[PDB]
């Protein structure tokens, strides 16, 4: 079997969900005692806000959480983590550190990798970062003709997009006084034609993210973009005033026509879908403002010490992730679904898709054996309350089990009409884990049925499909106000729990082999398409595909 | 037990399954027959475009084909089609014709509900937003200043929202000439608070979308929308410059205070999420132009009428809903991915989530017999390459089996570099199909090590996790470009999909009563957040909730 399987506290947890989940209802655990809330809830306080996370409405009990934090305990879980702190080389099939919490170190006490301290050049590129971002934002930076930038556009793919996609937009209210940002990731062509469609070559300021510098998706684009430069500069010299890299790759950088010394450079033991919190983040504090970035790392590094510091029994990640392991591996729940109720955190569902699908999509242990049972989910979810009127309907009512995260923050950065929106969001937040919890009995639904005046066939035949079953667990995460600092935060909480999910499941969170097989066909089709001969060197669908694109590019409709 | 279950077909084909379906390799089977593809794929000719149905990539055999058709026969999908096409009221719950088809009859052919042709009506509407779009085109519409409008707003959620909002983003280089199109549908304050601040009152027209006229997140944003309009205008009788509704409730459209001359019309026969044909269509059209509305109803006219006239074994919403059948109650699969390679369809998928999940997300069977069987699958995706460099690790070497429908236009609408971004996204598209299928066997991957000069000892660290399992299947949809015509077939056969497996598990895809209970919990606890004092009317989770807000509401950040 695998490490998971073959310990004793995950087959006494195993063993105890065969006999006895059946009779959990999360309608008799909340009549039966009163201080449930109480006993299964983390009010967190910051100093900077307060992040409340209820779990209570969960099919747990007492027993159940014990169950899960031995497990987590025999799982080497305290010690994985003080290695991955410590700068050990966790990520054990590239053998590199993991290392994004040394990014957001905020108290620099020395973090070693090879014996030397990381800490020095992690605060040499935050420097040069603010250095930057005082040039741009005031103004100073001037384009090719001499006027100031108004326009940042990154380019970049997976970690390199969707963590600084995600944080702008959910930080939109902090960028008074920032140019606007822009990201093009998509190779599709429709990205960036759209995105420069609406720019002045005078005013833009492109930065091209990607650590090798060689990228395919992301150089392409950055190729179009200082091609569609050029026609209005002519002048190779004038490349230097509107692109920048966040990179390592001196000699490529150079060779695009960048000055090396706006590379901002970051290490191999920052994950891509871990680097916002790096050089990557660049446009984040370009947008708004250095200080307000600074609070974003202070944020992520107060839960890094949440993390580090508390018995696992109250340790917010570690009880998100054993939640996550119970609904996983005991009830076999293929996804989980984030739903914040925040129109700004409508990119935060996608951008843990890589979080955690990337890094906990595996199935090879430590001992290099097959897994014998599941790991990550498929995470997925879109804003309330928008999602009550799209998907809920099958959460309610349909055959899946979907344990779902709902997020929300106290405060609004919007509080129109005297508030009366935010009352409105605030009450479906909480009614919707209400109604998931409770549903709707029998004898509740043919009271509303007799009083709508239907007839007594009517009635009987309408009465199971007003029935809600109930039973459906979620966790509530609640925070004072989505400002720079708790964002921060719950993204490393988040974090945190997708790294002990995967401790516990003995798979490797850090690295990305299964994208390989992918890019090695791709660069073998490209060739392929240009011109009318006949590609017969694939299977017949592959080959079917191709001659249907043969002969369907030069149709005109 | 249910309907499918009992079925004979259904319980022959789920044996075969559990005898069988491990013998099943895709490879393999692509190996031993050079006719697979032209097997099992559909060249559908429009006559304004092809689309290319390539489902050979699945688990299947001319054996389990012929099952599912088997099986689709004794479920009576065929009669059903009829009854649904002919205004049989087959919503049986809410004693309802289900007549979306209707919406898009460009053949005018009567279609009766109650002994009378809807067709009239459908076409007087379709009329009267032929001429206000003209009009507002044109800028011949002026506002209440005399200024041409520059901007319209949708406001609605749901089915309200997503038709409109995915197929204006999919069809945006159509808009050319056409007003700026903004929606709002939340109804967090975020939401129409960061769009009435991009706009003047002056040269604005909104458009309230709902069916009931009653959605609390709508009415309260057109409310809000109208207190910001009259703030500046200062005269009721301007309203009716700057307000249009698109509602089936005149009595409450006219209570909202919106000109009757105002109202463009729809009926109970038209399901929110099979909406955006109908008049709530008005963006779209505005957008794009009545023209381009056309053909896209005409393009899901021509797949309405495949659908009616094709036998099953050749029908492509039909095939792809067996296909579906097949993973969900026989391989279990949770999730179903729909994976666009076009950035303008970066909705698509969260439009089907309503589409299929809203649908088919049920419990109850017509007979009143709780389902003992899945029903609806949880529909998720990126577009590619977006979603290809966040998620895919998990789909090549993660621990479920996932169906995925990659779909791509030939043509793109931006051939910018001579063909080059598009060539990259059709290698991309291609090679991860092919990916997918193949995997890559411990013996070729022990070759690839080998090659780069491993050690004995790194090469036997790194095997393991270089090995791709593959056997995950997937259907390529391909089409000659995307077009309004082509877009509309495309949406109309996955309508078709979601209602023959609707069908075939014996539940109303047409219904949605899982939406209530959150409704009637949101309405008591509204008033409950006001004021200081504490709330212990609730379980003890929900009461805790509310405490931690009343408490953080007042904190400064």
């Given at each position: 079997?695998?490490?998971?399987?073959?310990?004793?506290?995950?087959?006494?947890?195993?063993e105890?969900?065969?006999?006895?989940?059946?009779?959990?209802?999360?309608?008799?655990?909340?009549?039966?005692?009163?201080?449930?809330?109480?006993?299964?809830?983390?009010?967190?306080?910051?100093?900077?806000?307060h992040?409340?996370?209820?779990?209570?409405?969960?099919?747990?009990?007492?027993?159940?959480?014990?169950?899960?934090?031995?497990?987590?305990?025999?799982?080497?879980?305290?010690?994985?983590?003080?290695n991955?702190?410590?700068?050990?080389k966790?990520?054990?099939?590239?053998?590199?550190?993991?290392?994004?919490?040394?990014?957001?170190?905020?108290?620099?006490?020395?973090?070693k990798?090879?014996?030397?301290?990381?800490?020095?050049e992690?605060?040499?590129?935050?420097?040069?970062?603010?250095?930057?971002?005082?040039?741009?934002?005031?103004?100073?930076?001037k384009?090719?003709?001499?006027?100031?930038?108004?326009?940042?556009?990154?380019?970049?793919?997976?970690?390199?997009?969707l963590?600084p996609?995600?944080?702008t937009?959910?930080?939109?209210?902090?960028?008074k006084?920032?140019p606007?940002?822009?990201?093009?990731?998509?190779?599709?062509g429709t990205?960036?034609?759209k995105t420069?469609?609406?720019l002045?070559?005078?005013?833009s300021?492109?930065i091209?993210?990607?650590?090798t510098?060689?990228?395919?998706?992301?150089?392409?684009?950055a190729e179009?973009?200082?091609?569609?430069?050029?026609?209005?500069?002519?002048?190779?010299?004038?490349?230097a005033?509107?692109?920048?890299?966040?990179?390592?790759?001196?000699?490529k950088?150079?060779?695009?026509?960048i000055?090396?010394?706006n590379?901002?450079?970051?290490?191999?033991?920052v994950?891509?879908?871990?680097?916002?919190?790096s050089?990557?983040?660049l446009?984040?504090?370009?947008?708004?403002?250095?200080?307000?970035?600074?609070?974003?790392?202070?944020?992520?590094?107060?839960?890094?010490?949440?993390?580090?510091k508390?018995?696992?029994?109250?340790?917010?990640?570690?009880?998100?992730?054993?939640?996550?392991?119970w609904?996983?591996?005991?009830?076999?729940?293929?996804?989980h679904?984030?739903?914040?109720?925040?129109?700004?955190?409508?990119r935060?569902?996608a951008?843990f898709?890589?979080?955690?699908?990337?890094?906990?999509?595996?199935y090879?242990?430590?001992?290099?054996?097959?897994?014998?049972?599941?790991?990550?989910?498929?995470?997925?979810?879109?804003?309330?309350?928008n999602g009550?009127?799209?998907?809920?309907?099958?959460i309610?009512?349909?055959?899946?089990?979907?344990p779902?995260?709902?997020?929300?923050?106290?405060?609004?950065?919007?509080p129109?009409?005297?508030?009366?929106?935010?009352?409105?969001?605030?009450?479906?937040?909480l009614?919707?884990?209400?109604?998931?919890?409770?549903?709707?009995?029998?004898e509740?639904?043919?009271?509303?049925?007799?009083?709508?005046?239907?007839?007594?066939?009517?009635?009987?035949?309408?009465?199971?499909?007003?029935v809600?079953?109930?039973?459906?667990?979620?966790?509530?995460?609640?925070?004072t106000?989505?400002?720079?600092?708790?964002?921060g935060?719950?993204?490393?909480?988040?974090?945190?729990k997708?790294f002990?999910?995967?401790?516990?499941?003995?798979?490797?969170?850090?690295?990305?082999?299964?994208?390989?097989?992918?890019?090695?066909?791709?660069?073998?089709?490209?060739?392929?398409?240009?011109?009318?001969?006949?590609?017969?060197?694939?299977?017949?669908?592959?080959?079917?595909?191709?001659?249907?694109?043969?002969?369907?590019?030069?149709?005109?409709?």
């Amino acid at each position: 079997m695998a490490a998971l399987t073959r310990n004793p506290q995950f087959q006494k947890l195993l063993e105890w969900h065969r006999a006895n989940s059946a009779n959990l209802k999360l309608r008799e655990l909340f009549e039966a005692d009163p201080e449930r809330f109480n006993n299964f809830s983390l009010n967190l306080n910051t100093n900077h806000g307060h992040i409340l996370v209820d779990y209570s409405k969960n099919l747990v009990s007492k027993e159940v959480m014990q169950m899960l934090v031995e497990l987590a305990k025999s799982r080497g879980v305290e010690a994985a983590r003080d290695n991955m702190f410590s700068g050990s080389k966790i990520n054990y099939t590239e053998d590199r550190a993991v290392l994004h919490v040394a990014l957001r170190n905020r108290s620099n006490t020395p973090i070693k990798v090879d014996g030397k301290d990381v800490m020095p050049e992690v605060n040499r590129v935050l420097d040069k970062m603010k250095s930057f971002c005082q040039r741009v934002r005031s103004g100073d930076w001037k384009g090719y003709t001499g006027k100031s930038i108004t326009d940042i556009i990154n380019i970049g793919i997976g970690g390199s997009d969707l963590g600084p996609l995600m944080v702008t937009e959910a930080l939109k209210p902090y960028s008074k006084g920032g140019p606007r940002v822009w990201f093009v990731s998509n190779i599709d062509g429709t990205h960036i034609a759209k995105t420069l469609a609406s720019l002045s070559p005078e005013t833009s300021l492109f930065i091209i993210a990607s650590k090798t510098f060689t990228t395919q998706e992301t150089i392409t684009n950055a190729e179009t973009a200082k091609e569609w430069f050029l026609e209005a500069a002519k002048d190779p010299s004038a490349v230097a005033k509107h692109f920048v890299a966040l990179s390592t790759n001196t000699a490529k950088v150079k060779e695009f026509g960048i000055d090396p010394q706006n590379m901002f450079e970051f290490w191999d033991w920052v994950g891509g879908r871990y680097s916002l919190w790096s050089a990557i983040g660049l446009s984040i504090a370009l947008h708004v403002g250095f200080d307000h970035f600074e609070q974003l790392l202070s944020g992520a590094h107060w839960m890094d010490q949440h993390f580090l510091k508390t018995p696992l029994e109250k340790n917010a990640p570690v009880l998100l992730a054993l939640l996550g392991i119970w609904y996983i591996n005991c009830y076999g729940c293929e996804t989980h679904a984030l739903l914040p109720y925040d129109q700004y955190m409508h990119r935060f569902a996608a951008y843990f898709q890589q979080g955690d699908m990337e890094s906990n999509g595996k199935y090879i242990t430590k001992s290099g054996a097959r897994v014998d049972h599941q790991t990550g989910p498929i995470v997925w979810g879109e804003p309330g309350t928008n999602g009550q009127h799209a998907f809920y309907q099958l959460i309610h009512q349909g055959t899946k089990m979907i344990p779902c995260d709902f997020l929300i923050p106290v405060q609004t950065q919007h509080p129109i009409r005297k508030g009366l929106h935010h009352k409105i969001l605030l009450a479906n937040f909480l009614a919707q884990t209400e109604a998931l919890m409770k549903g709707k009995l029998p004898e509740e639904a043919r009271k509303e049925l007799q009083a709508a005046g239907k007839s007594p066939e009517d009635l009987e035949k309408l009465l199971p499909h007003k029935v809600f079953e109930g039973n459906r667990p979620t966790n509530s995460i609640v925070f004072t106000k989505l400002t720079p600092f708790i964002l921060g935060a719950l993204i490393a909480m988040y974090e945190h729990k997708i790294f002990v999910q995967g401790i516990m499941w003995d798979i490797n969170s850090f690295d990305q082999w299964g994208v390989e097989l992918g890019k090695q066909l791709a660069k073998k089709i490209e060739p392929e398409l240009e011109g009318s001969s006949a590609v017969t060197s694939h299977d017949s669908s592959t080959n079917g595909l191709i001659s249907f694109i043969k002969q369907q590019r030069d149709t005109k409709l």
